[PDB]
């Protein structure tokens, strides 16, 4: 499955709750919810090498990684971390994150491309799971 494309959101659950359990204050949560309501996601996949750009009114994030090689990014609440992505199946990857400085909840994310061509992102902080679903433009 090729993840490459421009993706637009169709469903989102538990995003504000995920930020809440990470301790993000309500003003900042509502700003993130606003931003997240109209995102653009662009992915370029070349085999195990990925570029993913996520753009909203508050920021543009770009990550470049190769499956199986550590890279640096930020947690969903903005903390710098080392990340490592591995395949769980031919359609789904899972990323484990470790903070660069300090301690905090265990955070991770996953990305799956379904047989129906939907992209499902999950983001987890300990027991709380946010799921966002996208379709390819
Ligand atoms: Cl992502
Ligand atoms: Cl972020």
Curated annotation (Swiss-Prot):
As annotated, the Glycyl lysine isopeptide (Lys-Gly) (interchain with G-Cter in SUMO) covalent link is placed at: 101
Gene Ontology cellular component list: cytoplasm; cytosol; endoplasmic reticulum; extracellular exosome; nucleoplasm; nucleus
**Chief site of localization:** cytoplasm
Q: Where is this motif: Nuclear localization signal?
A: 20-30
Q: What induces it?
A: By retinoic acid.
Q: What GO molecular function terms would the record report?
A: cyclin binding; fatty acid binding; retinal binding; retinoic acid binding; retinoid binding; retinol binding
The keyword Ubl conjugation belongs to this UniProt entry's keyword annotation = yes
One Pfam short name: Lipocalin
- Please verify whether the record's keywords include Cytoplasm: yes
**Residues given in the record as all-trans-retinoate binding sites:** 132-134
Biological processes annotated in GO: embryonic forelimb morphogenesis; epidermis development; fatty acid transport; positive regulation of collateral sprouting; regulation of DNA-templated transcription; retinoic acid metabolic process; signal transduction
Q: PTM per UniProt?
A: Sumoylated in response to retinoic acid binding, sumoylation is critical for dissociation from ER and subsequent nuclear translocation.
Compartment(s) of residence: Cytoplasm; Endoplasmic reticulum; Nucleus
Q: Which UniProt keywords apply?
A: Cytoplasm, Endoplasmic reticulum, Isopeptide bond, Nucleus, Retinol-binding, Transport, Ubl conjugation, Vitamin A
Which protein family is it in?
Answer: Belongs to the calycin superfamily. Fatty-acid binding protein (FABP) family.
Function of the molecule: Transports retinoic acid to the nucleus. Regulates the access of retinoic acid to the nuclear retinoic acid receptors.
Q: How does it assemble?
A: Interacts with RXR and RARA. Interacts with importin alpha.
Q: What's in the domain note?
A: Forms a beta-barrel structure that accommodates hydrophobic ligands in its interior.
Listed name of the protein: Cellular retinoic acid-binding protein 2
What gene name is listed for this protein?
A: CRABP2
């Amino acid at each position: 499955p090729n993840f490459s494309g421009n993706w637009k959101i169709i469903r989102s659950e538990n995003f504000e709750e995920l930020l809440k359990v990470l301790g993000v204050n309500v003003m900042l949560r509502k700003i993130e919810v606003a931003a997240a309501s109209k995102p653009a996601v662009e992915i370029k996949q070349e085999g195990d090498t990925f570029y993913i750009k996520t753009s909203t009114t508050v920021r543009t994030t770009e990550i470049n990684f190769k499956v199986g090689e550590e890279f640096e990014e930020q947690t969903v609440d903005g903390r710098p971390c080392k990340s490592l992505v591995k395949w769980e199946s031919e359609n789904k990857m899972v990323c484990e994150q470790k903070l660069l400085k300090g301690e905090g909840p265990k955070t991770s994310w996953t990305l799956e491309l379904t047989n129906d061509g939907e992209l499902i992102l999950t983001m987890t902080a300990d027991d709380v799971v946010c799921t966002k679903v996208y379709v390819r433009e």
